[PDB]
């Protein structure tokens, strides 16, 4: 507690690298 952010894994999770990317453009194709 209060010192987890000192670590590289916690900082990587905090910075949210996935929020600076284009996730997808979903279509949900009705046919199968």
């Amino acid at each position: 507690e209060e010192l987890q952010d000192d670590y590289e894994d916690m900082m990587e999770e905090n910075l949210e690298q996935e929020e600076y990317e284009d996730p997808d453009i979903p279509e949900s194709q009705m046919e199968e």
């Binding site: 590289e8 900082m11 905090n14 690298q17 929020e19 600076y20 284009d22 453009i25 279509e27 046919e31």
Partner: protein, 451 residues
Amino acid sequence: DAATSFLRAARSGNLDKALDHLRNGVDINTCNQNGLNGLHLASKEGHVKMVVELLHKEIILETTTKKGNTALHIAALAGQDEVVRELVNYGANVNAQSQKGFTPLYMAAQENHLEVVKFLLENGANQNVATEDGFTPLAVALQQGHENVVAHLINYGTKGKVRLPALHIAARNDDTRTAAVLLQNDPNPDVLSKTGFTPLHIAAHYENLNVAQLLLNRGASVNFTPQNGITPLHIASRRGNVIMVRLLLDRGAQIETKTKDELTPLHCAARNGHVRISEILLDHGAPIQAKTKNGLSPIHMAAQGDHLDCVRLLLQYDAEIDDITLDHLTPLHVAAHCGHHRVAKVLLDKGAKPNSRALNGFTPLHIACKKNHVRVMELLLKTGASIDAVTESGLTPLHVASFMGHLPIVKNLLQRGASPNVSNVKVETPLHMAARAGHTEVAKYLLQNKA
């Protein structure tokens, strides 16, 4: 007398007397007959406040005694966990070797200081450094029977530094005194972490203005680009840090730089709906029509996040209301997909085309009928969306609603006068799709109509 009194005060932890002596003119680097200065004596006795105060007054951190021990060596041999942490936080070399070849890790391991051993290993202490005898921390811990230290040393192995660099930790806490000491010792403000982010990135993330200005005054790259292309301006725009965005732009942040997925800082601002940041970026010349890898403009990201005011601001700055992605999706298509009827209302009241065709010929009405977004459906039909529009495969909105089994959509479509006897490319009716998917209520409502 004065130096002896200062060293005695440092040993006893009398911070006020030591501060008075330093004010009088006593040199901070004076040491006793054994080569121990005030920092060594404070580190021996666990006086963390005295250690911090002496580090602030520019004591030489890597000064060695007559045995070659640094302050970190003495703190590790004495088992002062907080003093070890504080010394490492100010840039002490964890791999320093004394005259006989001992490292702080060796001193911590021989003395069964498990917390110090764990902290040193987490800060990149290399346990393969041997003394002049050839002994390692593991070997001395085995000889002394320190079972827990042996187990931790073996389990850690070669995991390396898993803690952030000290400048990153200082930037996270906005602590400018530690940052000033670190930059005095190591003059590089662009030190990289394992992820490749500079301390300026961390400062931009938490909007730590003071450490950000301190880093930029020492030569930090305001436009630093890691492998993924996330500049500090990107982080500041994504996080909503208006003041940090202003500071970075004033120090020369580039407005058009793109990430790996081709996102501009305006994309990050509009995706999270930061209206003021978006307006600042636009006033500084950000491209409003810039596209990501999938052809998404900032208005697409604003519409996807239900950021009504950001959509309004982007439209006010002459963003294309009918810009398409690579899948031929307009912002109205995205709004219908996500069910944001307020964004759709603002777009349609500003001239968006209600019958735009996607790659498969889907209108926004088709997508609204697919996802059971009834309010978007009413708004579209009120703003003149075609209720009998067909796709490439001939799917009417009633076909889509009946197949997905959305009872309110089917009810509202039949109430407004949608024919339930239409056909696909294959001769298939909405009743066919309702029966195929087993939606008994939708099929029953279709049968009460003229299906």
